[PDB]
Amino acid sequence: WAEAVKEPFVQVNPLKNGSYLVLASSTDCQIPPYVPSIVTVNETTSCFGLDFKRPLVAEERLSFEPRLPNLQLRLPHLVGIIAKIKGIKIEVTSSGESIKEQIERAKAELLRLDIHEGDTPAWIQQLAAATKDVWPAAASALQGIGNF
Amino acid sequence: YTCCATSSRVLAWIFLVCILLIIVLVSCFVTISRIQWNKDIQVLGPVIDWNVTQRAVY
Amino acid sequence: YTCCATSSRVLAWIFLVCILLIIVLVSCFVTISRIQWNKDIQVLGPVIDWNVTQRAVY
C-alpha cells in the first residue's frame, strides 16, 4: 500500500529502553532520510527540535526478540503520481509480483492523463519531473519551455 | 514602385512561411511530449530494502 | 605554371610583411618592460606600526 503524505514529514518515537525510532523526510544529527532507524546517543543532544537523551545503563539478560527475513521491493517509476490522483491509500503491488503485471496495472489510467488546452504549463512541468531521471537533457529543455 | 509591388509579394510569402512553420512546431511538440510520457510510464522504478548502512551520508 | 609564378610573388610579399612585424613586436616589448621596471623601482612602499588591532581578521 502507498499513500501520499505532506512534506516535511518528521516522526520520532521515544522507545522504552531509551533509544528513539526515527522516520523523517530530512536529515539531522547525521541520521539518513526516508529509511527508518533505531537511534541511540552517548550524550544528550538536540535533534529535530527535541532532546535525545543518553539512556541509563542496563543489565543484560537472555533475549527473545524476533529476527525477520530481509526483503528487496521494486516499485513503479511513477508511484508518487499514482498515490496522488487517488487521494486515498491504494494498493500498488504485491511482494512477489512480476515486472510485467506491475506495469499493466495503472498504464491505461496514466495514459489518459493527456495534454489539455487549459493546463498545458502545469502538464509540461509534470512531464519534466517524470523525465528528469530518464533523460536529464530533455527535462531541462521542458522546464525552460514551461517557465516561458 | 516596382520595389513596392515586389515588397507586397515578398511580404505575403514570408507571412505564409511564418504560419506553416507554427503549424509544424506545435504539431511536433504534441507528438514528442506525448511519446515521452508513454516512455516515462514504462521505465523501471526504484528498489527499497530497509538497509540504513547503504544510505549513510558522511 | 602561371599560378605557381603568381603564388611565388604574393607569397614573398606576405613573408616579408611577416618578418617586418616580428621585428616591431620584440622591439616594443623590450622598450615597455624596461620602462615599467624603472617605474616599479620608484613607487612608494609599505608602512608598519606594530598595531595588532589593525590586523584583526574575523
Binding site: C29, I38, V39, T40, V41, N42 | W50, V52 | -
Partner: peptide, 23 residues
C-alpha cells in the same frame, strides 16, 4: 588589545540500526 573566540572541535556518538520490512 584584541579579544577573540576560537572554535574548538567536539563530537557526540550516534548509533543506528535497521528494521527489516519496516516491522
Amino acid at each position: 588589545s584584541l579579544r577573540m573566540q576560537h572554535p574548538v572541535p567536539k563530537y557526540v556518538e550516534v548509533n543506528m540500526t535497521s528494521i527489516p520490512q519496516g516491522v
